[PDB]
Amino acid sequence: MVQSSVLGFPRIGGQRELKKITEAYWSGKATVEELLAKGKELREHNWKLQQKAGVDIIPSNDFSYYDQVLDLSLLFNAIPERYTKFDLAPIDVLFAMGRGLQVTALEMVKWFDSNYHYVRPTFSHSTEFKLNTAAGIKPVDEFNEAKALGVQTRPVILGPVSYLYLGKADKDSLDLEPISLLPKILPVYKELLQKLKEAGAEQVQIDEPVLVLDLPEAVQSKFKEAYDALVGADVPELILTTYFGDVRPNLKAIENLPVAGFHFDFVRVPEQLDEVASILKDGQTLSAGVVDGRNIWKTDFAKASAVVQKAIEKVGKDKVVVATSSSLLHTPVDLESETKLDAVIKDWFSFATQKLDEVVVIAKNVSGEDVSKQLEANAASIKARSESSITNDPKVQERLTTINEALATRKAAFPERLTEQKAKYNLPLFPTTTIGSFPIRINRNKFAKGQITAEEYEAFINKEIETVVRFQEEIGLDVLVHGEPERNDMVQYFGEQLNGFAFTTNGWVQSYGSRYVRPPIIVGDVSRPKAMTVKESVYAQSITSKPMKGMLTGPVTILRWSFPRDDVSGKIQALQLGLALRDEVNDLEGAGITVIQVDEPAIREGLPLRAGKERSDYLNWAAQSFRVATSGVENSTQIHSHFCYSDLDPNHIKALDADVVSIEFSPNYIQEFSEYPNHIGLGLFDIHSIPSKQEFVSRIEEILKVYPASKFWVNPDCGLKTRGWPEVKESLTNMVEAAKEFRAKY
Ligand SMILES: NC(=O)CC[C@H](N)C(=O)O
Ligand SMILES: [Zn+2]
């Protein structure tokens, strides 16, 4: 009998219970006892769900109130002094680190190339590692909970090498290399593992996902060092677990480890199987990650079972486990909550709950149990998807054949374009602009029910546009925005107006802490049926003689912030999105909106995890899909791009050939753009929470020393959606007043 395994379950609750109770706690409506009660209930619910499904190896310690990495920081006493001076209990120290205290919060960081964020482990020279036993030892206590329910679980802990390597030296210790602290942390891991075995844990999932990165040789050697120290008869068996990538470049590092087994991601990298299976020693198990833990597609059982069979061939059926490819943290909780999706489409999907049934069916299948009814129903679902008209749109398929270098190049290089733009706009030196958003629900809500006219709703959006435009005029901004009050979010607003997308009612996935996202789903070939943004931009331009920026989200961001298709490449999807947005750009320009900003916040997030062909191909096609969107315009049309990064690759920025770029900036990297003719707006203040006309005049005089004033735009770090009016007013006034003082001396 081949076992099934789940590497982690999302903890938000099928009804977002966790959000409700954590936010109620943080607001004071709920006690900490009520919060812990709800967490216990959620875990119990999830453990029973997995047991009922038939899952053999069920996780524990996967639950969290905020972040599992943060949970290990707490447990291991990686707690900076600043969070201990407030008389907080252990859980409120946790929340303080996670979300600050109203001390700013520890840094939030993308978890590999997933859409989840963890809280960066933060270490000092003074860090003293030890088991915080005051709180409770979370993994022991939750194992013990599950056991009292009659559920044996496998505790999940992030391993020592990854935990340190993904961490960072605190402000006070800028010279510390986190991985040097390995000898100090190992005893604390060993102790935790002894306690788990004593509680009755026979196996632990020890996550070492840093194995899918490019690791320095000096870091590669630390696996043998760590795992030699931990394994022994007084600890559970350890299953060294990787996901999201290819371990092959690091095989030498793990080829001689004493651990009980390994897990690999054969969804993202099925081709690594032969080689990784080759390092397995007699006695070691191979966990075959074959049900995707980061997307929503029903798994092809025929294909997944074949992969598992390849593994069985290598190491024996006794030593193979059918697993999720990663934790199901990255997927929504339950497809049965969806009430609006057409049943044809819904048939193509599986969310977390359904993935439990999948790993179980695939394990039965390879074990020789009769699951022919389930295989046949699955083969039907797969065939229906691949045959559907939603999936392949001949028009889009033909249009993709027009893509090339030419379609992705402007009519003239920037120097000739600048001449034509200068003639048209005559923008002064140190032109001032902002990034788009300014400081809601009832009219939206009643429009959605038919309680107010299309006519009635358009009036309030327009009044708000008007308010914002007059504001920016009043304070003398040179290139204006409409404020984006009609938009809810920067991806759904587009996806809802594109063919090839589906939307959930309840497909929530945790992004960070209690902030959850409900991504769009790309189901098929994408196209744009009609204008998406034109009406509001035109209105906004009709009420000022200042140039008005059109505002779009780029193709890569729409792709990366959606659940993508798993039957066609990322590239193909981004190019279809580039083509759709090209039509939008063409419509904006035709209608007189000839300054257009395209925002690509998610470019760095999608970067392939290792150096090599895949990474360089990605940078090439990311840039190309942007250029396909933006290259049809006249020379006198001014294309802007905004990036929410401080040190994004200068090379990639040049590849976009945007007339103007805005970059967050509030070291010497401004010099990288010296002999690059296109214009740059280095963000002057953090819109996350007034500077003075002097503080600005010092910041611009600072920058102005390393960069030509003729190329320099003045703007904030990002949109001011997430701010209040009174500080927006004073902050922007100062900003413009500053520019004018420079504008005077040139
Ligand atoms: N996140 C972003 O890229 C912000 C873009 C958007 N135009 C805004 O100003 O809110
Ligand atoms: Zn930004």
Side-chain angles (χ1 to χ4, degrees), residues 642 644 664 717-718:
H642 179 60
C644 310
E664 287 188 359
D717 272 20
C718 199

